[PDB]
Each structure stands twice: as C-alpha cells, then as structure tokens.
Amino acid sequence: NSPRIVQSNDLTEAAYSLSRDQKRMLYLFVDQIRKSHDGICEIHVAKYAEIFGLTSAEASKDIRQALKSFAGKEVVFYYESFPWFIKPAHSPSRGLYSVHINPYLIPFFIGRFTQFRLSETKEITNPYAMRLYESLCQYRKPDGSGIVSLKIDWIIERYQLPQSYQRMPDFRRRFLQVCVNEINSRTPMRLSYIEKKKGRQTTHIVFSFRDITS
DNA sequence: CCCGGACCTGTGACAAATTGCCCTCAGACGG
DNA sequence: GGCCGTCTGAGGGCAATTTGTCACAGGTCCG
Numbered sequence A: 001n002s003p004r005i006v007q008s009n010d011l012t013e014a015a016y017s018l019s020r021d022q023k024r025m026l027y028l029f030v031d032q033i034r035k036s037h038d039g040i041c042e043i044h045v046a047k048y049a050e051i052f053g054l055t056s057a058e059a060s061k062d063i064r065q066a067l068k069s070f071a072g073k074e075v076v077f078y079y080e081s082f083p084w085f086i087k088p089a090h091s092p093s094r095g096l097y098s099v100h101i102n103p104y105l106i107p108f109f110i111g112r113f114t115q116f117r118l119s120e121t122k123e124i125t126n127p128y129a130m131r132l133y134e135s136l137c138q139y140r141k142p143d144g145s146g147i148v149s150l151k152i153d154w155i156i157e158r159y160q161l162p163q164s165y166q167r168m169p170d171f172r173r174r175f176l177q178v179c180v181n182e183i184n185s186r187t188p189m190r191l192s193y194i195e196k197k198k199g200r201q202t203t204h205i206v207f208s209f210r211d212i213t214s
Numbered sequence B: 001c002c003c004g005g006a007c008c009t010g011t012g013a014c015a016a017a018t019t020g021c022c023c024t025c026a027g028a029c030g031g
Numbered sequence C: 001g002g003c004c005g006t007c008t009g010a011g012g013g014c015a016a017t018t019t020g021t022c023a024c025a026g027g028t029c030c031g
C-alpha cells in the first residue's frame, strides 16, 4: 500500500520543535534520502495535495509558509546541535520546490530503528501527538502491541513542550488527554495509560496499546 | 489544637494562533 | 504559427476551534 517510513531511534528521541505541516514534509525527505551523499530534495505541489487530501491552493500555502519557518531551527542529539537547512529553499519551476538538507544529518536518518506506514499518521493534527505516536512505534512488536514507561521530564525536554505545562494539571488537560484522544480517533491504534507517582509528584506515564486488527 | 505556608489537584476566563474554506488573477500548455 | 480555454498554483483574506497562560477554589501535611 502506502509508503513505509523508517527512521533511526535517534531522530525519534531528538529535541526539536516543528509544526504539523513541517513534520509532514520531513517524512517525505526521509523517504527520498533513504532511497539511494546528496541531500538535495524536491517536492511537487500537486503530489503533496493528493497524499494529504488538500487542494493545490492550500497545499501551495502549506509548503511555502512551512518552508520559510525552517530558518533558525536547530536539532539536538543527546548533547549536539545542528541546523536543518544550510541554504534557503527555492523554486526552479512553477509547482516545484528544491531544498538543501544539512549533509551531516544523513547518518542520523539511516542507522536500532523505528518504522510505520504514512497512512497511519496523515490525519493527526497536533504536532505533539505525532511525536508521541512515533515514540510508541519504536517499542512495537510484530503483532501490533506494546508497553512503555516514559519519564515526564524527558517528555518536556525532548518534545520541547511550552513552559506552563510544567504545572501538572495543565500538562494533563492540554497535552496528555487531548493526544491520547487523537490517536484513539485517527490511527489504527488503541491506547491506554496510567500515572506513576513518588510522593506527591507524578514522575512517569506508562503506556499500553494494541492494534484494532485483532 | 489551629495558624500561615508550601505543596498538590481541577476549572473558569481570556489571548493568540491554527484550521479548512473562499475568491482573484496570471503561468504553462495544447488543440 | 499564435491565441484562447483550461488546469494550476501563488496571492489575498475569514470565522470557529484549539492551544497557552494564569487567577482562584479547595484538599493534605509540616513546624
């Protein structure tokens, strides 16, 4: 069926802040690179629109604004920091974009690895829920189930959650609860969780999941 | 004992940003 | 050959929802 994205666990666990539309482009770049050094990639408006069910106009809007917002963004591997792009994007032909990814990032893309089909994620809206759905895939078994314990401090550092989510009731209300409900509504995964406490503080969240093909 | 204080939880308000939509008009191409 | 009819996509916008922030109500234990 649809394209199988694979990526090193190091990218899954990196520190960065990207919007939904930017994460969408990033999945296709990883796809192009892996099918091969170069680092020069390309995107056609009319193809983006068909994959994610957008019109050409709104696709054009999404590519263009995503693209100018990469400037100044950095990626951290735990630590080491890199820029995503080393030259501005540019369009040689109408309906075509050309981009220059940092060639030092190549080895981090292809390595202890993570994998999922693109149709699983293309309806998620909140970028933090994409981050969470990836980090769960890293632990999945062939049959489609898994269980993992993530530390709350590590979630805040790695997903670069905004500062007010250090108050636990806001963390619950605006990130944890909402994102477990997108995954349950928009992917083929069925997800549950429970809180681990130490004294008054909640320190970890323990996730279990299965696949709805069983 | 009960105080003020340092922790924790949940909800009500308001501000800022993102969503899918809508309209204009010229570029690229072929009949 | 060259104009025009169509398919694209590069611009300009919108209101309704969602995300980020902080005040206040209401629980416990410490000294």
Ligand SMILES: Cn1cc(NC(=O)c2cc(NC(=O)CNC(=N)N)cn2C)cc1C(=O)NCCC(=N)N
Binding pocket: A125, A126, B016, B017, B018, B019, B020, C015, C016, C017, C018, C019, C020
């Ligand atoms: C379905 N839908 C989702 C939204 N909004 C969102 O999904 C949305 C809004 C935001 N906002 C933010 O990031 C907030 N950030 C911030 N205040 N600092 C993030 N997302 C993912 C709006 C509507 C919608 O249908 N709007 C159009 C309604 C209409 N005018 N007919």
Ligand SMILES: [Mg+2]
Binding pocket: A058, A062
């Ligand atoms: Mg959009």
Ligand SMILES: [Mg+2]
Binding pocket: none
């Ligand atoms: Mg009293």
Ligand SMILES: [Mg+2]
Binding pocket: none
């Ligand atoms: Mg008093």
Ligand SMILES: [Mg+2]
Binding pocket: none
């Ligand atoms: Mg009351």
Ligand SMILES: [Mg+2]
Binding pocket: C026
């Ligand atoms: Mg009180």
